[PDB]
Every structure is written in structure tokens, then in C-alpha cells.
Structure 1
Amino acid sequence: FLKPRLVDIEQVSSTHAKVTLEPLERGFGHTLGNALRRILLSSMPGCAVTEVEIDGVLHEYSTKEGVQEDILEILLNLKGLAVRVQGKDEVILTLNKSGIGPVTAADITHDGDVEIVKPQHVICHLTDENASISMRIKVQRGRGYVPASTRIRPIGRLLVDACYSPVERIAYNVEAARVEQRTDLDKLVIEMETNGTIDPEEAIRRAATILAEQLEAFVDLE
């Protein structure tokens, strides 16, 4: 059989892209299509938020004098806040900002491994001429969906739900290619959609690594 390779990464935008595979025998386009789609949505490494500890907040259902939104809406906003970390498997992030204006992610203290992928992402609107929020944001690695109920202690450490997945939408469309003098060969076009924290070559490589491990469950390595 002829064997597929990474022929191209088409970074069509900063968020998402299209990888392309070539060639494939007939039938394998849908096989690696459904396979790699289902794996890329299944189990990729992620960097979601887990715990946010706001200064003057005992419980997550109160106000905070100086910011128009609730504590809880800050928790959903940070629940959608996406980050890339490399050298660790967890990290603590610090936020400090005062004065009237939006609290964007740029005011979070960035480290040598902390990388906010989208600094444009709003968090909350401060509204007072002299007031501030000051929170610590615990971010760890993980995999899949983990709700805050099924995990595993002071009253200040809040809890939110974990959304450990980078991927947003996986799409693929099989088609023929310009293979030299040969027909019935297949150009695989994958269109993945990502929040931005996973490179696509690493994405499809970790995916096929995992599915090769699951076939490796009953055949040896070659």
C-alpha cells in the first residue's frame, strides 16, 4: 500500500488551519477521516483553568464593589480563557489591575512559560475611579471534560469547571489528488478549528500517536 505523509500545513488564520495528507488508498480517506476526527475531539492535551482565588470574596455568588459584572460571570470568562504552557504541568497566574476600564488578559503577569494566546479576551469591566481586583488563577494540564463536582479546602479557593480541550471543530473532506500517472488515489484535507494553543502538526501527530497506541494494545511495534 502507498503511504500517507504530511504534505502541507495551511495556516489559513491564526486560530485554525488545514493540514493535508497524501496519498491514500481508496476507503482510507474516510477511515483516517472519521478516525482522526474522533481522536482529535477525544483526547488532546490541554491547559484549562481550574481554580481562581479572588481577594475579597468568600463565596462565588456575591458582588464585588467596583466591577459591574458578578463573580460568576468572571468565572465563565476565565473558563473561556485559553493559555499555552510548556515546561510545567501546572502553574499559578496572578492578576492585578485598577482604574476604570476593561480588565484584559494582558494585565495578567506573564511568565517564561505562560503564554496567553489571545490577549484581546475581556474578563471584566472595572467601573470605579479607585478600586481593583486582585486574583490568583491556578491553571493545570488535563484531558477531556472534568466537572468541578467529580474532582478529588479553605473557603477562599473557589472552584470552576475544567474544559481541558483545545479543539473547537474538526472537519474533513476527502478528494482526489494530482498523483502522477495513477488514479483512485486520495488527497486528505482536514480542517481543524482550534482556540490556538496546539500546533496542528503536533495535533495530528499526538492523535495518530494515541490511535497507534490503541492498535498497539494487541499488535507489537514496527
Structure 2
Amino acid sequence: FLKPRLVDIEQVSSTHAKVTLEPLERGFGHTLGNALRRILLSSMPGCAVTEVEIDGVLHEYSTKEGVQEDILEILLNLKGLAVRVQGKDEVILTLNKSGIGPVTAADITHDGDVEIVKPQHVICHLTDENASISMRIKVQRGRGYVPASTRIHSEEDERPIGRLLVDACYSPVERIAYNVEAARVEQRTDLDKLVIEMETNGTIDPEEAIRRAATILAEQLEAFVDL
């Protein structure tokens, strides 16, 4: 009944890493590793842009007079930006770019809480010099895929129709594979060593995530202890 334990999270790259657990018993690490997988793909507090009220945009079916791309496209490239928040769950920013050039993600009103993983992610392409595009980006935090579709039912009467929304996919995690194999300790025939090979987008830290996700499993054990 030996307790379980991890080792140093082997950080090969900033995007993906691998944890390793030595103290596993026969069977546990296998089914629990699969059980963790679902959790590390569902109950994860992700960050996703929800409301983007743009300067000269009443609807996403238009193109800013001065940009190369299309507004609809630009909104998908906003979903392509990985951002971190620390204190508040929500924050409104403002993109301010002018001049011919691939608009990097570091020209925005940078709040101390807003945290980009890569300020080099081009959102749009400015092709003119006298075009200063501005856009308030309301990003927040939640978990799982929560689309603007399911959210427009309450609506709160969004009369200000300059405010164009987007689907909030709250998922940091990405590709999860687990490498089960014989755990070689000298006092036992063979235990189990779970080498969790994980891919992330680069927003929430793995250890933060796994203790947090295990606490969600704790929530999901509550009634399983209650009879």
C-alpha cells in the first residue's frame, strides 16, 4: 500500500514536458493514468477571448480599411494566441498598431496580469501606414469548450452591436500519452513507472495542473466515500 510519488518534471521544451512516477502498484498506474488523461483534458481552467469590440467593425463579415487579412480570419488568429492571467479571471486589453508590418502580439496595452507565451504571434497584417487599428479584447477564464453559441442565450441584451464575440475554448492541455513500463526498484518483483508524456499550448503549469486536477478528483471522490 506504498504511497505514490513523482520525480522532477523533465522540461524538454517550454511547450511540452514529461513527469515520472516511481511508486506505482500493479494496475493502478494504468487505469488511473487513463482516468487522469480525461481530467487533464476537461477540468482545466483555460483562457479564451470572448468579446472583441473593434474600432470600425460592426460585424466580422467586413475587413478593416487598411488591413490585408479579413476580420473573421483575425478573430481566429486571436484564438491562436496563448495568453496567461494571474490575478483576475478577466481583463480587457487594447490593440494599437500602425505602420506596414506583420502585427506581432506585443503592441497591445500590456497589463501586468496579461501574459503572452509568445509576443511574436502575428494576429493581422497591416499594409498601410495611416491606419491605426484599435480593438478591446475581453478575455476570461473557465474550463472546457464553452462556445459563444451557448452563451448568447442569456445575451444580457447585447445592443452595442459593435461588440463582436468569438467561441471560448478553455483548454490549455493538448496531446496526452502515458508510457507504462516496469518500474525497477530492488525491493519488489516489479512496480509501475508512469512517464506521462504531455503536450500543452503553454499557459498553465503542469504541476499546478496535476495537483489541481487531482483535487478535482478529490471532489469526484467525495460522494464515492459517502454512503
Question: What interval of TM-score do these two structures reach, taking the shorter chain for normalisation?
Answer: over 0.9
1:180 offset after TM fit, Å?
2.6
1:5 offset after TM fit, Å?
1.2
For the Cα contact (< 8 Å) 1:126–1:132, is it kept in 2? no
Mapped to 2, the partners of 1:160 and 1:190 lie a distance apart of: 33
Q: Deviations over 1:114-157 (max 9, x none)?
A: 10111121101100132121111000111111111110531111
Q: Say which is worse superposed, 173-182 or 61-70, in terms of deviation.
A: 173-182
Mapped to 2, the partners of 1:217 and 1:47 lie a distance apart of: 30
Q: Deviations over 1:155-177 (max 9, x none)?
A: 11111001111011111111122
Mapped to 2, the partners of 1:94 and 1:17 lie a distance apart of: 33
For the Cα contact (< 8 Å) 2:184–2:190, is it kept in 1? no
Q: Deviations over 1:42-68 (max 9, x none)?
A: 110111111111101111101111111
For the Cα contact (< 8 Å) 2:145–2:168, is it kept in 1? yes
For the Cα contact (< 8 Å) 1:8–1:20, is it kept in 2? yes
Q: Which residue of 1 aligns with 2:36?
A: 36
1:213 offset after TM fit, Å?
1.2
Q: Tell me, what secondary structure is at the counterpart of 2:32?
A: helix
Mapped to 1, the partners of 2:148 and 2:37 lie a distance apart of: 27
For the Cα contact (< 8 Å) 1:47–1:84, is it kept in 2? yes
Q: Say which is worse superposed, 91-100 or 170-179, in terms of deviation.
A: 170-179
Is 1:103 aligned to 2:103, yes or no?
Answer: yes
Q: Tell me, what secondary structure is at the counterpart of 1:13?
A: coil
For the Cα contact (< 8 Å) 1:8–1:21, is it kept in 2? no
For the Cα contact (< 8 Å) 1:49–1:81, is it kept in 2? no
For the Cα contact (< 8 Å) 2:103–2:122, is it kept in 1? yes
Between the aligned residues of both structures, percent identity stands at: 100
Mapped to 2, the partners of 1:89 and 1:148 lie a distance apart of: 17
Q: Which residue of 2 aligns with 1:57?
A: 57
1:220 offset after TM fit, Å?
6.0
Q: Deviations over 1:101-120 (max 9, x none)?
A: 01111111211111011112
Mapped to 1, the partners of 2:201 and 2:180 lie a distance apart of: 24
Mapped to 2, the partners of 1:93 and 1:192 lie a distance apart of: 31
Runs ≥4 residues deviating over 3 A: none
CA RMSD, aligned part only?
A: 1.5
Mapped to 2, the partners of 1:108 and 1:180 lie a distance apart of: 56
1:181 offset after TM fit, Å?
2.5
User: How many pairs are equivalent?
Assistant: 221
1:184 offset after TM fit, Å?
1.9
In structure 2, stretches of 5+ residues that fail to align are: 153-158
1:81 offset after TM fit, Å?
1.3
Mapped to 1, the partners of 2:216 and 2:77 lie a distance apart of: 31
Mapped to 1, the partners of 2:108 and 2:15 lie a distance apart of: 21
Q: Deviations over 1:172-204 (max 9, x none)?
A: 111122313322201110011111111110111
For the Cα contact (< 8 Å) 1:58–1:156, is it kept in 2? yes
Mapped to 2, the partners of 1:104 and 1:27 lie a distance apart of: 48
Q: Tell me, what secondary structure is at the counterpart of 2:36?
A: helix
For the Cα contact (< 8 Å) 1:14–1:196, is it kept in 2? yes
Q: How does 1:39-188 map to 2 (within 5 A)?
A: 39-152=39-152, 153-188=159-194
Mapped to 1, the partners of 2:120 and 2:192 lie a distance apart of: 40
In structure 1, stretches of 5+ residues that fail to align are: none
